[PDB]
């Protein structure tokens, strides 16, 4: 997440508000001074230095993380943007259109804008390219994993913040005393724009026993809930048949048309687009628009505010109308009891903001403040006729102090507890802290219980026993978080491999067409979705599509959802193919790939390097998130559930599921556990609260947290004299370095009532 | 769980742990027992807080 933020997101934030234009009017009493000036400051490429520190006297030198911890410094690096200055002049002739020209004052020029704190072992950090002997030279422990910041000497970890996913249509049942039966709401969000969140709620008024059940939507900047038919007519869809066609996609679904009949009877006398836009224009919350302009104002509400995640440009009213019909369709499907209400605790509908997106939004706010300060200083210099100094224009302390304050304190703004002091009691405690997540809790869901969708993504038994029980979650061992990719290549490939656009989609002529969703945006329909899903899966398994992209085919409701956004928690799984040579389903990974992996592993301790990405690129393994996990069948073990079918009474009873249609296999079930629970020997022979208690108390143990404790001046440090690796050990802790940095001793233990003491 | 087929109301599908603690839990049984233990811990914390309120 941090490498994605530094490599790509910083430039995106710079380019989103790069141009800053101040028009100085002529303000001429006489025609002698009829010249108008237009000063433009534009940011260009952003550059990041290696980590460094400037002292009091002004000498600046390369800063290494050992020195930043000892001297209570901040392990940060400088940001330098290219700024080009444009000065334009135009002859201010009234009536004549102004035509600006350059006066050839195009001076351009790296300028320092602030210090970004550098996560350790990231690509900008010095420790990423360092070998083991280099780390020992720098007095850094090679067992140290990075993933944290050094702010004023303190090691600060950013806890992953769990939020609801954006751009998803969620339908909920309201309470009985409420006049609304069901609400279909969407938190429309955009990434490549102003990053503003708009809530759109389509509500079915009236209870089941009531007869006048109408549907009204809550548009942004509109005080009253507009009826849906008026919104459809304001979106250019006047006739009632086309509105019900956009809402109800089956001509035989007469009950949904019955429940839509009071809606079309409600806004009946409004039969024009202009009348509907006037009706929306009456309820505008600005309350300052003249007679002829409210139409345009309503169009503004229907262009830049009503469902911004679809489009913000003009001429896209058909897609917004189809998506509104889709939301009403979902609402009425929940109202007709064809589908249940959306599970708010479903982990596929959640996103995890890691150090990338959190620093992304923080830097976006800080850079907006910096650009406002630049404009204010520039306006003050041109108005009060002072000289312009670029060193005074750009206050780098804004960016530097904002990042330093939001990382030193837990406060994320101007959300608390986002940044925490890294635990260094034991090595496993640090490992568990670096994979810790947090769910901020005022809803009617049940976020504290372990959900079904939490399988293989967060640890089933690793949570605090206190008020943070269930809200603080720890990732399982193989669980990862997607950093987000560009959906535009996937959209282009879909449009160029037979996805009909939504503009020319008629539901009655194409009743079997499958809706295609990319990041919650309905982009069109496909007549043959099985071939499309096969092509997309082959592209993802050969690496042409990024493996973090999730592709879900819901065959029942005829939907194809593609997610490329960040925050999705996925896990790797084996691929099970047809394998016609053996006549039955088999894993694509074979003994030859295993031999290549072990050859590479023992080379690491001359043949070709065969790594995890080699398995990923050959389609042997795949990344599956909780949304894609709903459409697959996973075998627990390869040698038991794949091949077609006396028993040891000591072994546990295990079923084979009596079904051979598997698409995936678990790599190992023990990877559902987190870092702390992987220390537990035989956790399947324990009661689950005891596993939770041990996952809590393993962080309080004593061991060797780092091998360079002699050169670290930590506030408190506890080191056992004689750590011992456990006699009973798990395979998983071989990857947790528990046999290298143990946290206990093998004591000869008698279970006896010896003395009553 | 994604390891079961749709509409499976068998005891092993919906959370019956046929194995003892001696024989060890299957991974599905392990996860279902983890859900039960998590519900127990949540109920314990909520009960303690509400009963402290009631007692005061």
């Amino acid at each position: 997440s941090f490498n994605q933020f530094v490599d790509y997101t910083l430039q995106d934030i710079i380019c989103e508000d790069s141009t800053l234009i101040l028009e100085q009017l002529a303000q001429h009493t006489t025609e002698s001074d009829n010249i108008s000036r237009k000063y433009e400051i534009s940011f260009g490429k952003i550059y990041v230095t290696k980590p460094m520190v400037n002292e009091s006297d002004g000498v600046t030198h390369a800063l290494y993380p050992q020195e930043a911890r000892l001297r209570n410094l901040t392990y940060s690096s400088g940001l330098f943007v290219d700024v080009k200055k444009r000065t334009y002049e135009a002859i201010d002739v009234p009536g004549r259109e102004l035509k600006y020209e350059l006066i050839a004052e195009e001076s351009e020029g790296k300028v320092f804008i602030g210090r970004l704190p550098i996560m350790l072992r990231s690509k900008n950090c010095y420790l990423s390219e360092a070998t083991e002997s280099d780390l020992y030279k720098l007095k850094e422990c090679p067992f140290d994993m990075g993933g944290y910041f050094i702010i004023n000497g303190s090691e600060k970890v950013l806890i992953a913040q769990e939020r609801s996913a954006g751009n998803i249509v969620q339908v909920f049942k309201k309470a009985a005393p409420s006049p609304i039966s069901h609400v279909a709401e969407i938190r429309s969000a955009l990434e490549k724009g102003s990053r503003f969140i708009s809530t759109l709620q389509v509500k079915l008024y009236g209870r089941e026993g009531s007869s006048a059940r109408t549907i009204k939507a809550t548009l942004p900047y509109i005080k009253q809930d507009i009826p849906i038919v008026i919104i459809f007519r304001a979106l250019g869809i006047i006739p009632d048949g086309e509105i019900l066609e956009h809402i109800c996609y089956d001509v035989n679904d007469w009950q949904m048309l019955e429940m839509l009949k009071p809606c079309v009877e409600d806004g009946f006398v409004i039969q024009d687009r202009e009348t509907a836009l006037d009706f929306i224009g009456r309820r505008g919350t600005a309350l300052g628009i003249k007679k002829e302009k409210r139409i345009q104002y309503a169009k503004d509400i229907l262009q830049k505010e009503f469902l911004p995640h679809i489009t913000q440009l003009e001429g896209f009213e058909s897609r917004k109308a189809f998506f509104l019909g889709y939301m009403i369709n979902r609402l009425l499907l929940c109202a007709l009891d064809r589908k249940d209400q959306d599970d708010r605790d479903h982990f596929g509908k959640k996103r995890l903001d890691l150090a990338g997106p959190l620093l992304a939004q923080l830097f976006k706010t800080l850079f907006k403040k910096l650009t406002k300060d630049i404009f204010r200083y520039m306006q003050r210099t041109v108005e009060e006729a002072h000289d312009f100094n670029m060193k005074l224009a750009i206050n780098a302390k804004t960016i530097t102090s904002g990042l330093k304050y939001a990382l030193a304190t837990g406060n994320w703004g101007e959300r608390a507890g986002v940044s925490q002091v890294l635990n260094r009691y034991t090595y496993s405690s640090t490992l568990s802290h670096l994979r810790r997540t947090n769910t901020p809790i005022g809803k009617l869901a049940k976020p504290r219980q372990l959900h079904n969708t939490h399988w293989g993504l967060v640890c089933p038994a690793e949570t605090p026993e206190g008020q943070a029980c269930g809200l603080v979650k720890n990732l399982s061992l193989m669980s990862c978080i997607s950093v987000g990719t560009d959906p535009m290549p996937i959209i282009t490939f879909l449009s160029e491999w037979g996805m009909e656009p939504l503009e020319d989609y008629v539901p009655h002529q194409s009743p079997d067409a499958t809706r295609v969703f990319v990041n919650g945006v309905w982009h069109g329909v496909h007549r043959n979705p099985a071939r499309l899903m096969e092509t997309l899966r082959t592209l993802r398994r050969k690496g042409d599509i990024n493996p973090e992209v999730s592709m879900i085919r819901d065959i029942r409701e005829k939907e194809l959802k593609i997610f490329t956004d960040a925050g999705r928690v996925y896990r790797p799984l084996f691929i099970v193919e047809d394998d016609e040579s053996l006549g039955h389903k088999e894993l694509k990974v074979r003994k030859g790939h295993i031999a290549k992996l072990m050859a590479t592993e023992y080379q690491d301790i001359d043949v070709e390097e065969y790594t995890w990405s080699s398995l990923l690129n050959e389609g042997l393994v795949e990344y599956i998130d909780a949304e894609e996990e709903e459409s697959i069948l996973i075998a627990m073990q390869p040698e038991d559930l794949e091949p077609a079918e006396d028993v040891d009474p000591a072994k546990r009873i295990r079923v084979s599921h009596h079904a051979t249609t598997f698409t995936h296999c678990e790599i190992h079930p023990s990877m559902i556990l987190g870092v702390a629970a992987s220390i537990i020997p035989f956790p399947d022979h324990n009661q689950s609260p005891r596993n939770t208690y041990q996952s809590a108390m393993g962080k309080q143990a004593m061991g060797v947290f780092l091998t360079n404790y002699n050169v670290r001046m930590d506030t408190m440090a506890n080191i056992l004299y004689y750590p011992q690796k456990p006699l009973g050990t798990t395979r998983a802790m071989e990857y947790l370095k528990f046999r290298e940095l143990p946290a206990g001793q093998n004591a000869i233990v008698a279970i006896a009532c010896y003395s009553g003491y | 769980l994604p390891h079961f087929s749709k509409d499976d109301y068998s005891p092993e599908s919906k959370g019956f742990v046929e194995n003892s603690y001696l024989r060890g839990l299957t991974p599905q049984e392990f996860f279902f027992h983890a859900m039960g233990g998590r519900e127990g811990l949540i109920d314990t914390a909520v009960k303690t807080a509400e009963t402290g309120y009631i007692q005061r």
Binding site: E465, A696, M697 | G52, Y53
Partner: peptide, 24 residues
């Protein structure tokens, strides 16, 4: 300070639950 997972109830601290239910 400290970071312990040994859950120690804050005593005489029912005002958390009092603020949970001030509406009847």
């Amino acid at each position: 300070n400290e970071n312990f997972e040994d859950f120690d109830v804050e005593h005489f601290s029912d005002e958390e639950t009092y603020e949970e239910k001030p509406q009847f």
